[PDB]
Amino acid sequence: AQVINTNSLSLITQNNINKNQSALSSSIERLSSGLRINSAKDDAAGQAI
Amino acid sequence: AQVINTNSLSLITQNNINKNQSALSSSIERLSSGLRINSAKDDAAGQAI
Amino acid sequence: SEAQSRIQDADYATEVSNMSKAQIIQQAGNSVLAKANQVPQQVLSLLQ
Amino acid sequence: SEAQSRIQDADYATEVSNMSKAQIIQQAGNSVLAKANQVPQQVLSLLQ
Amino acid sequence: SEAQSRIQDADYATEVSNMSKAQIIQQAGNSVLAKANQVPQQVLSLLQ
Amino acid sequence: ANRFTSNIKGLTQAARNANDGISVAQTTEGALSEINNNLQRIRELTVQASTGTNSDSDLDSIQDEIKSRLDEIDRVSGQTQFNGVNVLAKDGSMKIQVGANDGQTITIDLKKIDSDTLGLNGFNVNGESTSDPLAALDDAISQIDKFRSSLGAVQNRLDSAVTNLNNTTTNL
């Protein structure tokens, strides 16, 4: 082995999971309610219109 | 995964269900009776008229 | 009302697929993180 | 609630790796400690 | 009747999530307690 | 190595501050959305009130409900707060420190929002009545719409800052 103090590969995996986290949360949150905008983290101009 | 104690995603889901249920109750109570006004917390002036 | 319908609508067809993809990605990431944690035990074997 | 979740949350994803790494380092340290206790034995050959 | 229902209402949606969280925490605690009992084992190998 | 560790810890603290800000913004945005719903409710029934068919007695009940809604708007504006800080009490600025080095912060702007700030503050329909209720209410709603747009923009900026900081910390 080469790295024993730090699991940088684990850090990479955790970053990938964290990146997927936002997509999963947004998808399920938008699925729960009818509105696509949902308190617009999304496009603001469409929300105003 | 990060969600451990407060299942925030399902929590917003439950929040959405309550907002749905309010309109569901209003719709069903308006449909059951022939009166749309239904004890006017909705349109006081129309009910007085 | 028809105009409003386009701007905001869940469009469940895309949303269910996106949710499935995200679930698969999360499960795969956790599974591979397991093997990542299992990797470094060869250090102990090298000692003895 | 979702705000306090950020301040107060276990986040096992980082904690389990820390636990595993600490255990690996612990067993490595104990093994090298045993091999270190083995070290001063060479004096006996010198004496006789 | 509605007044009484408001004071004492089940609203299964929140309690099902709470109970599920409860067994998740319980099973995680038992799993980590296994490793907790495992921790002092290596002293035997430390002995010799 | 020591410098790198200090940098990593600073970046982690900056990410935590960014999370604080990202929560603050969404709380304030929800409050203003709930305020805007009240403006819409005002809109529909002032539209019906402007019609001359409704009698004089009708306008009194309409104005009573209008005053109730306006008082509710003022109340929700005053009440809402985050961690001992009233977001809508005064027009002000809050800076979120998202940089390990000194002075690198991202600004969040808040403006005071009460019944008077949006306009009318004296809205009457039974007389003398407001010269133009309707476009005044539209102008009020547009302001909260732009405010939500700004909060959404800063929300996205903080999210991007968090993901950038995560990548940077992992690489370091």
Curated annotation (Swiss-Prot), chain F:
<comment type="similarity">
    <text>Belongs to the bacterial flagellin family.</text>
</comment>
<comment type="function">
    <text>Flagellin is the subunit protein which polymerizes to form the filaments of bacterial flagella.</text>
</comment>
<protein>
    <recommendedName>
        <fullName>Flagellin</fullName>
    </recommendedName>
</protein>
